[PDB]
Every structure is written in structure tokens, then in C-alpha cells.
Design a protein around this ligand. Structure first.
Ligand SMILES: CS(=O)(=O)NCCc1ccccc1
Length: 166
């Protein structure tokens, strides 16, 4: 049973205008089987629009491609992002953690999504009591993208609500 195709796609921005379906495929096939690979072009001139997309057979292949960044494709460093525009952020809100969840609980869980730079457990301005939510900042947006597409996050026994934070 295959993962939904939307979760297997990478949008690739910043392409060289010389990149073709074939050269984009040859590059990204290093990290998995590509079921689709397209450079977007103008319908009249055929000139590249400077972006395209690739679709891998599995989510683990998407992960492998993202972990191999930076990608230099046909001499230009490109910008891959997983899948209406992408809100590219490095920080998440984590809600539902109650008063007993500590920094190490959040670190031990979230560090497997990406490199953590900041963990902020929110406390009440007046009393110092924990408010039951936190923010985690990573060094890169793909961590957040992987996190927010999961249906569930269980941290310190709590079913958590996790969203992109601006
Ligand atoms: C094969 S790759 O494209 O994933 N990495 C090539 C090395 C490189 C990347 C970015 C800038 C300069 C060099």
C-alpha cells in the first residue's frame, strides 16, 4: 500500500533554465525511484519557468533526497521543498503538553526530525507556572514540514497539537 502521492513529491525551485525533465531525473534518481519528473515551462515559448517537481516511489526516498541537500543541479543550487503556497518556517508550536512536560521530553522526541536550535517551554508571566505549550526552532524548514504532516504526535504520554509557528 503506497503512501499518498502528494507526500512523495518534491517541488524544486531555482532551477537552471537549461535543466530538462531528463537532467532533473538523472540528478534526483540518485536518491530513489522517480515515478514522475517534470520541468515547468511556458506553454508558448517552451522556456523554463525555473521550477519543477519530482515524485519518488516512497516517503523514505523523499527523506533521502532532502538529507542530501544542498543539491546543485546543472550547475545551480536548487531549492527542494515537500508539498496553495508553501509556508516555509523553522519553528513549531507544540500544544497539549500540560504542566509535567520538560525540555528533555521535547528534545528527545523532536531531535529525530531535525537539528534543534531553541526549545521554549511557555510559562505564565505572573506566576511562572507552565502554560502547557512550547515552541521548538530547528535549523531548517524540512524538519517542520515532516512534523506537521503527521496525523499524531505523542510526547511525554500526551497527544499533542503541532502547528507551524510564524
Ligand atoms: C550531488 S548534490 O548536488 O547533492 N551535492 C553536490 C555538492 C554541492 C552542493 C551544493 C553546492 C556545491 C556543491
Amino acid at each position: 500500500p503506497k503512501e499518498p502521492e502528494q507526500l512523495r513529491k518534491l517541488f524544486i525551485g531555482g532551477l537552471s533554465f537549461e535543466t530538462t525533465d531528463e537532467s532533473l531525473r538523472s540528478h534526483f534518481e540518485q536518491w530513489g525511484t522517480l515515478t514522475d519528473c517534470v520541468v515547468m515551462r511556458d506553454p508558448n515559448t517552451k522556456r523554463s519557468r525555473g521550477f519543477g517537481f519530482v515524485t519518488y516511489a516512497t516517503v523514505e526516498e523523499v527523506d533521502a533526497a532532502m538529507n542530501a541537500r544542498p543539491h546543485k543541479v546543472d550547475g545551480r543550487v536548487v531549492e527542494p521543498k515537500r508539498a496553495g503556497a508553501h509556508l516555509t518556517v523553522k519553528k513549531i508550536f507544540v500544544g497539549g503538553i500540560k504542566e509535567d512536560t520538560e525540555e528533555h521530553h521535547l528534545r528527545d522526541y523532536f531531535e529525530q526530525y531535525g537539528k534543534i536550535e531553541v526549545i521554549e517551554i511557555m510559562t505564565d508571566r505572573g506566576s511562572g507556572k507552565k502554560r502547557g505549550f512550547a515552541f521548538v526552532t530547528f535549523d531548517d524548514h524540512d524538519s517542520v514540514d515532516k512534523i506537521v504532516i503527521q496525523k499524531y504526535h505523542t510526547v511525554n504520554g500526551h497527544n499533542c497539537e503541532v502547528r507551524k509557528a510564524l
